[PDB]
């Protein structure tokens, strides 16, 4: 026969975990999608020689677009 199981309250831990997951995901799903879209459509730069008489900007010495920005 079904008896009652005396446990401490699980409402508050569960609510905390849902809130933490919610906020972390709220801002971290857009970042994951943005990094994917950048990596797929923009991509990294390719190594090239410095053309004659040309002087690159300081950010043009890095290959990843996010690091460059």
């Amino acid at each position: 026969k079904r008896l009652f199981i005396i446990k401490p309250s699980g409402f508050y831990d569960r609510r905390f975990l849902k809130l933490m997951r919610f906020y972390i995901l709220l801002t971290g799903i857009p970042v994951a999608i943005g990094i994917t879209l950048v990596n797929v459509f923009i991509g990294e730069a390719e190594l090239a020689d410095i053309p004659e008489g040309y002087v690159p900007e300081h950010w043009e010495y890095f290959k990843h677009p996010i690091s460059r920005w």
């Binding site: 401490p8 309250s9 409402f11 508050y12 831990d13 609510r15 905390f16 809130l19 933490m20």
Partner: peptide, 12 residues
């Protein structure tokens, strides 16, 4: 009493 959201968030 049960753990508050404040305490859990502080630990995290």
């Amino acid at each position: 009493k049960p753990s508050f959201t404040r305490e859990n968030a502080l630990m995290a």
